[PDB]
Scaffold this active site. Structure first.
Site, PDB file in Angstrom:
ATOM      1  CD  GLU B 121      45.513  43.876  20.096  1.00 19.47           C
ATOM      2  OE1 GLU B 121      45.626  44.515  18.906  1.00 19.47           O
ATOM      3  OE2 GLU B 121      44.851  42.924  20.134  1.00 19.47           O
ATOM      4  CB  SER B 175      42.534  41.945  11.334  1.00 18.18           C
ATOM      5  OG  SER B 175      43.339  40.828  11.411  1.00 18.18           O
ATOM      6  CB  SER B 178      43.367  49.616  17.935  1.00 14.12           C
ATOM      7  OG  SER B 178      42.687  48.260  18.255  1.00 14.12           O
ATOM      8  NE  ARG B 190      40.879  49.253  20.729  1.00 13.29           N
ATOM      9  CZ  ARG B 190      39.613  49.157  19.980  1.00 13.29           C
ATOM     10  NH1 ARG B 190      38.663  49.803  20.571  1.00 13.29           N
ATOM     11  NH2 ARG B 190      39.628  48.562  18.711  1.00 13.29           N
TER      12      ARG B 190
HETATM   13  N1  LIG Z   1      51.647  38.659   4.042  1.00 13.15           N
HETATM   14  C1  LIG Z   1      50.482  39.001   4.341  1.00 13.15           C
HETATM   15  N2  LIG Z   1      49.354  38.251   4.631  1.00 13.15           N
HETATM   16  C2  LIG Z   1      48.385  38.706   5.006  1.00 13.15           C
HETATM   17  N3  LIG Z   1      48.101  39.887   5.179  1.00 13.15           N
HETATM   18  C3  LIG Z   1      48.875  40.845   4.836  1.00 13.15           C
HETATM   19  C4  LIG Z   1      50.346  40.476   4.521  1.00 13.15           C
HETATM   20  N4  LIG Z   1      50.749  41.591   4.233  1.00 13.15           N
HETATM   21  C5  LIG Z   1      50.180  42.826   4.769  1.00 13.15           C
HETATM   22  N5  LIG Z   1      49.239  42.129   4.986  1.00 13.15           N
HETATM   23  C6  LIG Z   1      47.805  43.388   5.457  1.00 13.15           C
HETATM   24  O1  LIG Z   1      48.289  43.414   6.852  1.00 13.15           O
HETATM   25  C7  LIG Z   1      46.815  43.157   7.623  1.00 13.15           C
HETATM   26  C8  LIG Z   1      47.458  42.479   8.735  1.00 13.15           C
HETATM   27  O2  LIG Z   1      48.170  43.620   9.655  1.00 13.15           O
HETATM   28  P1  LIG Z   1      48.752  42.941  11.056  1.00 13.15           P
HETATM   29  O3  LIG Z   1      48.890  44.523  11.714  1.00 13.15           O
HETATM   30  O4  LIG Z   1      49.705  41.964  11.169  1.00 13.15           O
HETATM   31  O5  LIG Z   1      47.401  42.435  11.674  1.00 13.15           O
HETATM   32  P2  LIG Z   1      47.215  41.321  12.930  1.00 13.15           P
HETATM   33  O6  LIG Z   1      47.946  41.788  13.957  1.00 13.15           O
HETATM   34  O7  LIG Z   1      47.257  39.973  12.384  1.00 13.15           O
HETATM   35  N6  LIG Z   1      45.543  41.690  13.000  1.00 13.15           N
HETATM   36  P3  LIG Z   1      44.891  42.230  14.795  1.00 13.15           P
HETATM   37  O8  LIG Z   1      44.416  41.097  15.410  1.00 13.15           O
HETATM   38  O9  LIG Z   1      43.552  42.885  14.078  1.00 13.15           O
HETATM   39  O10 LIG Z   1      45.745  43.136  15.563  1.00 13.15           O
HETATM   40  C9  LIG Z   1      46.219  41.973   6.773  1.00 13.15           C
HETATM   41  O11 LIG Z   1      44.692  42.461   7.002  1.00 13.15           O
HETATM   42  C10 LIG Z   1      46.553  42.670   5.266  1.00 13.15           C
HETATM   43  O12 LIG Z   1      45.718  43.835   5.105  1.00 13.15           O
HETATM   44  C1  LIG Z   2      42.312  44.556  16.830  1.00 15.99           C
HETATM   45  N1  LIG Z   2      41.058  44.343  17.393  1.00 15.99           N
HETATM   46  C2  LIG Z   2      41.055  43.185  18.586  1.00 15.99           C
HETATM   47  C3  LIG Z   2      40.050  45.005  17.204  1.00 15.99           C
HETATM   48  C4  LIG Z   2      40.147  46.133  16.147  1.00 15.99           C
HETATM   49  C5  LIG Z   2      38.703  46.810  16.207  1.00 15.99           C
HETATM   50  C6  LIG Z   2      37.547  46.528  16.705  1.00 15.99           C
HETATM   51  C7  LIG Z   2      36.457  47.418  16.665  1.00 15.99           C
HETATM   52  C8  LIG Z   2      36.291  48.230  17.560  1.00 15.99           C
HETATM   53  O1  LIG Z   2      36.897  48.991  18.274  1.00 15.99           O
HETATM   54  N2  LIG Z   2      34.936  48.727  17.871  1.00 15.99           N
HETATM   55  C9  LIG Z   2      34.290  49.544  18.741  1.00 15.99           C
HETATM   56  C10 LIG Z   2      33.593  50.910  18.056  1.00 15.99           C
HETATM   57  N3  LIG Z   2      32.561  50.375  17.375  1.00 15.99           N
HETATM   58  C11 LIG Z   2      31.332  51.056  16.993  1.00 15.99           C
HETATM   59  C12 LIG Z   2      30.345  50.667  16.479  1.00 15.99           C
HETATM   60  C13 LIG Z   2      29.122  51.390  16.341  1.00 15.99           C
HETATM   61  C14 LIG Z   2      29.051  52.541  17.323  1.00 15.99           C
HETATM   62 CL1  LIG Z   2      27.604  53.385  17.130  1.00 15.99          CL
HETATM   63  N4  LIG Z   2      30.069  52.873  17.861  1.00 15.99           N
HETATM   64  N5  LIG Z   2      31.025  52.169  17.876  1.00 15.99           N
HETATM   65  C15 LIG Z   2      32.977  49.108  16.456  1.00 15.99           C
HETATM   66  C16 LIG Z   2      33.723  48.041  17.153  1.00 15.99           C
HETATM   67  C17 LIG Z   2      37.751  45.442  17.753  1.00 15.99           C
HETATM   68  C18 LIG Z   2      38.754  44.764  17.907  1.00 15.99           C
HETATM   69 MG   LIG Z   3      47.872  43.427  15.510  1.00 18.64          MG
END
Ligand SMILES: Nc1ncnc2c1ncn2[C@@H]1O[C@H](COP(=O)(O)OP(=O)(O)NP(=O)(O)O)[C@@H](O)[C@H]1O
Ligand SMILES: CN(C)c1ccc(CC(=O)N2CCN(c3ccc(Cl)nn3)CC2)cc1
Ligand SMILES: [Mg+2]
Ligand SMILES: Nc1ncnc2c1ncn2[C@@H]1O[C@H](COP(=O)(O)OP(=O)(O)NP(=O)(O)O)[C@@H](O)[C@H]1O
Ligand SMILES: CN(C)c1ccc(CC(=O)N2CCN(c3ccc(Cl)nn3)CC2)cc1
Ligand SMILES: [Mg+2]
EC number: 2.7.1.33
Lengths: 352, 352
Positions: B121, B175, B178, B190
């Site tokens: 991703e 959600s 990153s 990352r």
């Molecule tokens: N139509 C919509 N429905 C839901 N969320 C939306 C919408 N439009 C914008 N958002 C926002 O966009 C965010 C999701 O962004 P997005 O980049 O598509 O994440 P994702 O790829 O689904 N999640 P991730 O697995 O963490 O990479 C949601 O958390 C909302 O804050």
């Molecule tokens: C989009 N996707 C799959 C995704 C995005 C975000 C995360 C969270 C993340 O990357 N982490 C690492 C750093 N972390 C802490 C926490 C405490 C400390 Cl003391 N240090 N680091 C928190 C969790 C995980 C997955």
């Molecule tokens: Mg995403």
């Protein structure tokens, strides 16, 4: 004049009071009845009014301070009740720190002839922290850590030596969070801060659960399951995200399961309280870790009253800092967490 | 087989579809009616079912891809509705990324003879971001910034050149969040992530206000006053905290005024929505700033759908990054925010 130091924060007032215990017969004769009644009132009560509390377990006994022997007492009450405190006083040199030393300066001056000396809230924090560790906690270590924080059958509080405390990252979790890098007794800087602190925990928890106290919020959180509200890595990937070493149990989106109406309808208040605690605590840990790496400091000490009677957050910080730093950083804690500014203020007395 | 790339995230599925526009008369004759009906369905509709949307304004026209000329389309729908998508398909090489490429692998394989190729991703994000900037947005800049983000009578969207894009900090606000450091087309890592992302905004906002969509949450926030819920520096100090350069308007404790029952009773849903937006956005900005300083990168580009139709958060990020970095860091934005992973997946087609 009684020897006080005061730290007036956004939420709590902390007061350190030195009670002399080497009073002569002649000195007791020179004691005005107002002073004697103040000393009696403070040392014979552990609750003051409806909201003041003396933390008796923290008392430092037979401390030598400014050439006198005495007991150092630690007292707290809500900043909201400072008017009652000042009105009680309206019936003397005050070293005061925290934002309230500035905000309420004019109110303290309604006490006739009172000399108010405002001291910086982070200078006082560093001075008090170094002082208390130096004198020890009645012979015990002031500083501790959680040994083997990754294995819960082993995780236990253990003492940590800070005889050479530098360098040190200090993370002060109050209403908000201040992060300090301390390179020497005279060389420290505020690295940054975050507004996601103890007031965020308490405010969000109150909105989400209707709890009416910090202690109730913690009791709710102790019974909750944060994963009912949080979206985990395994909820998105079906397992670990192996490529970047993210385990399936890591939180990917705090409160992220609450975008679904059916999940909002089934989550408990306790689950929401625990999710709030986990969200705030993990964010503070991650910000602390990023700051430690930037400052090239491997000892991170957490203070402030967000962690008072809050073993859940302390253990989460200990585990998280160790896990995510691959063992390069250590979370440290201090027994007199919330009181260091008040002590540092008291230590400024000789300069006036 | 139609040329698709798919990014299945925790919340949204993003789909990039290449529509060939150089079809010969003979090629149209070789087109099976199922394929022709797919092309017609996608290009003649802008809403698909009840939850799918084609973002027509983002279409890249007359793009040359894999030796063909065509239009690149951008389509999104909720991950919750992926079963409908797969059932529609059950009536072909799929390059797929995001956590859902793994979680729903077995479901995609219920489509007979479908070859599923899972791609990372964040590799897909970098490849798609670099590609779209390289081809431009129909002759316009893909990347923009907010010029003079500190003075609102001057703050305006302006183009930014990324012809030499390295190094670059990429902050992907989905959600969760990153954070990537991109040093070359083949060298990226990352740095970290945070779980306080777009799902936290939407989940907390739904709990606090009862809003039922991301767009409604933003509409509420646009009408709110976050300072009704947040405690500011001036609420604690009575003014600025001059010693550390903290202005009185800075948030000291997010939701920190909500520890008082009378304030919880007077705050509006709109105030709470705006406080949630400000809290999440400021935290992302601060984490981005700390990561940029650590990685010694001064260009920070923000992507992901948290910022879709969200000018409030974009301007807050632009102002905050400039202000708190004293002008050392610049917040950058891209027109095709949420779609870079889906494009990068599509670009993996030749390797299969
Ligand atoms: N139509 C919509 N429905 C839901 N969320 C939306 C919408 N439009 C914008 N958002 C926002 O966009 C965010 C999701 O962004 P997005 O980049 O598509 O994440 P994702 O790829 O689904 N999640 P991730 O697995 O963490 O990479 C949601 O958390 C909302 O804050
Ligand atoms: C989009 N996707 C799959 C995704 C995005 C975000 C995360 C969270 C993340 O990357 N982490 C690492 C750093 N972390 C802490 C926490 C405490 C400390 Cl003391 N240090 N680091 C928190 C969790 C995980 C997955
Ligand atoms: Mg995403
Ligand atoms: N009895 C209590 N009442 C209120 N909050 C408490 C209490 N006990 C612990 N807390 C927590 O402690 C936090 C305040 O910590 P504290 O270090 O005293 O901050 P402060 O100095 O009042 N604020 P600041 O101006 O930001 O330095 C609150 O936000 C709560 O999370
Ligand atoms: C205890 N007390 C008085 C206190 C504590 C905490 C704060 C918050 C704080 O220190 N800041 C600075 C960093 N910040 C951002 C924001 C965005 C970015 Cl892009 N960068 N930094 C946020 C606000 C203020 C005061
Ligand atoms: Mg404080």
């Amino acid at each position: 004049s009684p020897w006080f130091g005061m730290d007036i924060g956004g939420t709590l007032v902390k007061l350190s009071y030195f009670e002399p215990i080497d009073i002569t017969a002649e000195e007791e004769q020179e004691e005005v009845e107002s002073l004697k009644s103040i000393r009696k009132y403070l040392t014979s009560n552990v609750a003051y009014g409806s909201t003041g509390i003396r933390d008796v377990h923290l008392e430092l006994k037979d401390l030598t301070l400014f050439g006198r022997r005495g007991n150092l007492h630690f007292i707290r009450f809500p900043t909201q009740d400072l008017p009652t405190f000042i009105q009680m006083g309206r019936d003397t040199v005050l070293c005061a720190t925290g934002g309230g030393a500035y905000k309420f300066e004019k109110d303290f001056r309604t006490i006739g002839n009172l000399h108010l000396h405002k001291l910086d809230e982070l200078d006082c924090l560093v001075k008090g922290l170094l002082y208390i560790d130096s004198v020890s906690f009645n012979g015990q270590a002031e500083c501790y850590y959680f040994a083997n924080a990754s294995e819960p059958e082993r995780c236990q509080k253990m003492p940590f030596n800070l005889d050479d405390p530098y360098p040190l990252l200090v993370v002060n979790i109050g209403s908000g969070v201040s992060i300090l890098a301390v390179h020497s007794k005279d060389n420290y800087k505020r690295v940054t801060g975050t507004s996601l602190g103890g007031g965020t925990f308490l405010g969000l928890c109150s909105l989400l659960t209707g709890c009416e106290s910090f202690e109730e919020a913690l009791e709710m959180a102790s019974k909750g399951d944060s994963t009912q509200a949080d979206k985990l890595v395994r909820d998105i990937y079906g397992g670990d995200y192996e490529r970047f070493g993210l385990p399936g149990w890591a939180v990917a989106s705090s409160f992220g399961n609450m975008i679904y109406k059916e999940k909002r309808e089934s989550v408990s208040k306790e689950d929401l309280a625990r999710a709030t605690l986990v969200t705030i605590t993990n964010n503070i840990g991650s910000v602390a870790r990023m700051c430690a790496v930037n400052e090239k400091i491997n000892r991170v000490v957490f203070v402030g009253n967000f962690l008072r009677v809050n073993t859940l957050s302390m253990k989460l910080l200990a585990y998280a800092l160790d896990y995510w730093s691959k063992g390069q950083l250590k979370a440290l804690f201090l027994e007199h967490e919330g009181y260091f500014g008040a002590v540092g203020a008291l230590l400024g007395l000789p300069n006036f």
